[PDB]
Design a protein that fits this description.
The structure is cut from a larger assembly and holds chains A (62 residues), B (101 residues), C (213 residues), D (356 residues), E (112 residues) and F (136 residues). With 356 residues, chain D is an alpha+beta fold. Chain D has nine helices and 21 strands. Chain F has a single domain, classed as 2-Layer Sandwich (Nucleotidyltransferase, domain 5). A five-stranded mixed beta sheet of chain F has the order 3-2-1-4-5. Classes of the chains: A mainly beta (62), B alpha+beta (101), C alpha+beta (213), D alpha+beta (356), E mainly alpha (112), F alpha/beta (136). Chains B and F meet through helix 1 of B and helix 3 and strand 5 of F. Bound molecules: magnesium ion and zinc ion. The structure holds one RNA strand of 161 nucleotides. Chain B: It holds the Pfam family Ribosomal_S26e.
RNA sequence: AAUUCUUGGACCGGCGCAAGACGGACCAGAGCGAAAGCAUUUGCCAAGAAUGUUUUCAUUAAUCAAGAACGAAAGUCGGAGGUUCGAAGACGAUCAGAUACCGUCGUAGUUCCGACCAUAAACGAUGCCGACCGGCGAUGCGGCGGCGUUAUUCCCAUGAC
């Protein structure tokens, strides 16, 4: 599947077992309106880019 | 000592209400004593929906739901954490917990 | 050490003329090896097809049962057996704070077929209603149920099976009952929940081949 | 875009989900039949221009020819020689990345015999550059306001036509292909070259492809100018703040706000076969001053890398194009109109008399 | 809701007519014209309105053909007005033929 | 081994009965009739341990073998008839229901129409276990 | 996990047939009943509280030793029945032991008809009758007054708010 860019728009909350994954609201650079929720490792900032291997799957919001 | 006013049950002016089998055990609890719960669930959980949204023959077939009404005895309800113990003041609060999202 | 699907003929299934999409699908049978015959073993198979698939595209919650009452040649000819609403629909309708009214009539068509029709209807809450409940008193319930039976009998009794299926393809019976019971207590989610088949007349072929065009 | 008259017959309707699902493989290489015009050398020294060391954006008087398929003399010659689908880069860029379309746009199809002249309406707003089209809210301002969609698009078009020439060493010996520009010191730096695409399903495609300038390292440039007007209301981040820690963020944010404009510009360069597409970061003096501009920075992207980055699919672009050329090489002669539904996401196709 | 895919209204309308219930067949078509499905004129909106105004004539309900066209003129504004022209010409055309038949009926069979 | 349907567009439908108890999973394809069986791969045929007959894993293996086995006979698409145990017992499907339905969609089949067919009684016979339930 | 069931085709899918239980969801701090208790449809039989009344009799009333009717479940005797469940039993596990909790079968019983039995945390742990003493918003049955909405299009008049 083509690799697609999701842009962090608003960092929401921290998740995982040991508080290790930042759960972030992403706004797609490809489609104008589609905004999904993704679990992300490492430190992430409000207003930067992610390279998603799939642009359809969504993580369970808490 | 008297703990509840309505003796842990929603019977007031009957005398007898027919019993029900608990859905975890097969314990006989009266119909109104039991902790009832109505689970409306999608057949396919969370991610399976996307795979069956693409591998479907049809055009926007709103895949069906699963309606299951569950009666728990008080022990099964507390053990499964469907209910919990409460403060002497908070016990009287009958307004069910908010389900905003 | 015998491949059991080597001796299997596929047969195309045909629905009667009352539906848009004719052919339902395919059916497996064993080749006529010994005394027991493919077509005779194939005769009396019940196919439960959703009306969405049976028409082009519509309601998917109403299902029709169809019996392969005869085979002409590489073609199973099905005929109306029964009808049933889907679990999802029936479970979704039945909700708390209202009265559920159920009727059943044992009525016969002009030709041999004697059906058992089950009707269901739920008391509707008014547009400006502040009262939570919206229950019907027992006499209001059995006046509604008496009227349910009176329409359900009249609609079938006087015409033949080709036309009763033409009425069940929409829900003309349920819409007629719903409008009729507006004075007693306004119902809303009124359908003919289920149609059963108790008796058929002794099989004819000329009567089948009028239903198959 | 246009008021639709009661004499105009809707024949075909296509919505964006159906157009998004389209594909075509097997699209062959573009063959440079003709290369025309003269292109200047680019000063790579306008890239020592950052948030601290900016430049004045000056008015440059160079004449831009907005000549369509109808008025193209080479296409008029080539028409009888070979080709049955004639287009410009701006027109096919619109149809190709039609999926992102927000505002009302239109294309006049003219099927004279067994031909498709994908023509544009001269003296209609087709050669404007739209602004914050695909934001959370497009500018909801009135025609008399300065932050209006019309006035922002007006100045955005001006600064692009300014920037393309200003950055350029536009009085040092030009790179000449074969011919002078077929439209006429006074002129602007632009080169029009025509290309044949053999298109699988039995269509030959002759499109006019525009290079903006040449750079050494030789190299061909498609050059455009990104506008930032009043970020805080515009629903974007500020440019002047630092832009250096947040360059990738300032880019990706202005991309979503201008989803269709950046998609048309990038597929414009892929069409022409430009190996590099550059940009120009232009903002105002004060946030409500329409007259003044200052050039903050520029960044360069290879359009093949950029198109897979931002988002595009060549299969989609060529898959939508084969569909529309097939539709209008199927149905009858005369003037048509591919108009997109002003308020909803669906393109419509009307059949019209010989006049409008 | 009532419908997904607004062409299904025609199939319910057609299904009800084979039984001979043009009042609920009209109710079906009425429910679609006034709903979410206001997408600026789908190609299927003409056959819906053609059948709708045929049933409005056959039952003689002018005040419904009012509301029907009043919804239609809105959902086929400057997008395409040929649709209004074709529909309302075909409406008055259908009503004129019902009166032609109604006179000739009363004036040759019943007059004699 | 030859369903004579058209190679291009024609989908041949089966119907897959996914009986998912809380200590076994069945995946069972038949005719639209429901009379003639094509495949039946249980959760227990695949894995050899009693404690994981009702596994999402075992149900995933079972649906994969069913998908592969029915692709050869020329069943392209499937209708679905999911069920728990029912009667007096549980009416929530087993934990293998989801993984099986997912598995024969990951394995390149097409999904027609789905519905619960649990034996829901009007009112039933007395349930197993005493008046005081299953105490543990 | 094992006891148990099965290539003498179990479990699973399909079409039929028979039996004996039970009346899901709707079902509520709703209704009725002296209490125990009482729920699929329809018919027949007798009873009943409450409201309504400018009818009738005119103290006929309240509570009750003796005496009497009904009284869940289990239990007993005789007849019919035995689908599910299941005291004792028989084994399989668990454990130091387990005569238990967990499992597989399973007899009396569980169901109906006719005779006994007369006890329950039979509870509101709260005798029955009568009077007076704050407020508030619902709820079920009956009656009364009242803007308006709605179904009978034909609306008087009936239902639903
Ligand atoms: Mg009691
Ligand atoms: Zn329990």
């Amino acid at each position: 599947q083509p690799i697609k860019l999701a842009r962090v728009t608003k960092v929401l909350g921290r998740t995982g077992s040991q508080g290790q994954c930042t759960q972030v609201r992403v706004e797609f650079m490809d489609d104008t309106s589609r905004s999904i929720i993704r679990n992300v490792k490492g430190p992430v900032r409000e207003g930067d880019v992610l390279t998603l291997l799939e642009s359809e799957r969504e993580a369970r919001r808490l | 000592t008297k703990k509840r006013r309505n003796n842990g049950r929603a019977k007031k002016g009957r005398g007898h209400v027919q019993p029900i089998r608990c859905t975890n055990c097969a314990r006989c609890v009266p119909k109104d004593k039991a902790i009832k719960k109505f689970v409306i669930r999608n057949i396919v959980e969370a991610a399976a929906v996307r795979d069956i949204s693409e591998v479907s023959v049809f055009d926007a077939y709103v895949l069906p739901k699963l309606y299951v009404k569950l009666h728990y005895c008080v022990s099964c309800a507390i053990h499964s954490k469907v209910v919990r113990n409460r403060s002497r003041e908070a016990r009287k609060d009958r307004t069910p917990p908010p389900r905003f999202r | 050490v015998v491949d059991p699907f080597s001796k299997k003929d596929w047969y195309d299934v045909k629905a009667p003329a009352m539906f848009n999409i004719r052919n339902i699908g395919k059916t497996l049978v064993t080749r006529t090896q010994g005394t027991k015959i493919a077509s005779d073993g194939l005769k009396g198979r019940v196919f439960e097809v959703s009306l969405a698939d049976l028409q082009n595209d519509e309601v998917a919650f109403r299902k029709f049962k169809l019996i392969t009452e005869d085979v002409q040649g590489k073609n199973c000819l099905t005929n109306f057996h029964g009808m049933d609403l889907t679990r999802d629909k029936m479970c979704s309708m039945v909700k708390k704070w209202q009265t559920m009214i159920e009727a059943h009539v044992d009525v016969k068509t002009t030709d041999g077929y004697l059906l058992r029709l089950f009707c269901v209807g739920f008391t509707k809450k008014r547009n400006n209603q502040i009262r939570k409940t919206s229950y019907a008193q027992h006499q209001q319930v059995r006046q509604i149920r008496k009227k349910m039976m009176e329409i359900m009998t009249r609609e079938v009794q006087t015409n033949d099976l080709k036309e009763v299926v033409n009425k069940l393809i929409p829900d003309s019976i349920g819409k007629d009952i719903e409008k009729a019971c507006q004075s007693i207590y306004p119902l809303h989610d009124v359908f003919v929940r289920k149609v059963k088949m108790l008796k058929k007349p002794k099989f004819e072929l000329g009567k089948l081949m009028e239903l198959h065009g | 875009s246009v008021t639709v008259r009661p004499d105009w017959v809707t024949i075909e309707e296509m919505d964006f989900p159906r157009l998004s699902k389209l594909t075509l493989p097997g699209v062959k290489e573009g063959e440079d039949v003709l290369c025309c015009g003269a292109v200047e050398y680019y000063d790579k020294s306008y890239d020592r221009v950052n948030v601290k060391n900016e430049k004045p954006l000056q008015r440059i008087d160079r004449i831009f020819h907005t000549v369509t398929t109808t008025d193209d003399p080479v296409i008029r010659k080539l028409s009888k020689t070979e080709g049955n689908v004639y287009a410009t880069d701006a027109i096919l860029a619109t149809i190709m990345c039609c999926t992102r379309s927000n505002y009302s746009w239109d294309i006049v199809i003219e099927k004279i015999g067994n031909k498709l002249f994908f023509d544009k309406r001269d003296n209609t707003e087709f050669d404007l550059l739209t602004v914050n089209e695909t934001s959370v809210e497009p500018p909801q301002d009135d025609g008399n306001s300065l932050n209006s969609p019309r006035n922002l698009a007006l100045e955005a078009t001006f600064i692009n036509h300014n920037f393309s020439q200003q950055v350029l060493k536009s009085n040092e010996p030009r790179y000449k292909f074969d011919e002078p520009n077929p439209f006429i010191g006074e002129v602007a730096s632009v080169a029009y070259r025509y290309r044949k695409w053999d298109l699988n399903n039995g269509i030959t495609l002759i499109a006019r492809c525009e290079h903006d300038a040449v750079m050494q390292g030789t190299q061909f440039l498609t050059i455009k100018a990104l506008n930032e007007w009043d970020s805080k209301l515009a629903n974007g981040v500020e440019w002047r703040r630092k832009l250096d820690t947040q360059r990738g963020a300032v880019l990706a944010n202005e991309l979503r706000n201008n989803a269709c404009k950046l998609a048309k510009w990038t597929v414009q360069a892929l069409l022409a076969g430009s190996d590099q597409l550059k940009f120009g970061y232009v903002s105002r003096a004060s946030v409500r001053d329409s007259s003044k501009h200052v050039i903050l920075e520029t960044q360069q992207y290879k359009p093949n890398e950029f198109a897979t980055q931002i988002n595009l699919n060549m299969d989609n672009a060529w898959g939508i194009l084969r569909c529309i050329i097939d539709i209008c090489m199927n149905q009858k002669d005369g003037k048509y109109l591919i108009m997109k539904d002003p308020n909803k996401p669906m393109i419509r196709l009307y059949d019209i008399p010989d006049n409008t | 809701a009532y419908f997904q895919r607004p062409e299904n209204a025609l199939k319910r309308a057609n299904e009800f007519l084979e039984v001979g219930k043009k009042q609920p067949a009209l109710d079906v078509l009425y429910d679609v014209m006034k709903s979410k499905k206001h997408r600026t004129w789908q190609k299927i909106h003409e056959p819906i309105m053609l059948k709708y105004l045929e049933l409005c004539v056959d039952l003689r309900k002018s005040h419904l053909a009012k509301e029907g066209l009043y919804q239609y003129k809105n959902i086929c504004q400057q997008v395409n007005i040929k649709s209004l022209e074709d529909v309302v010409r075909a409406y008055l055309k259908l009503a004129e033929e019902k009166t032609e038949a109604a006179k000739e009926e009363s004036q040759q069979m019943v007059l004699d | 081994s030859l369903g004579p349907q058209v190679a291009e567009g024609e989908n041949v439908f089966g119907v897959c009965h996914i009986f998912a108890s809380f200590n076994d999973t069945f995946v069972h394809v038949t005719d639209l009739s429901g009379k003639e069986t094509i495949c039946r791969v249980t959760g227990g045929m695949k894995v050899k341990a009693d404690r994981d007959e009702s596994s999402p894993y075992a149900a995933m293996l079972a649906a994969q073998d069913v998908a592969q086995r029915c692709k050869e006979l020329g069943i392209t698409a499937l209708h679905i008839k999911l069920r728990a145990t029912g009667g007096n017992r549980t009416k929530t499907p087993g934990p293998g229901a989801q993984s099986a339905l997912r598995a024969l969609a990951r394995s390149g089949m097409k999904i027609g129409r789905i519905e619960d067919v649990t034996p829901i009684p009007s009112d039933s016979t007395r349930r197993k276990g005493g008046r005081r339930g299953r105490r543990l």
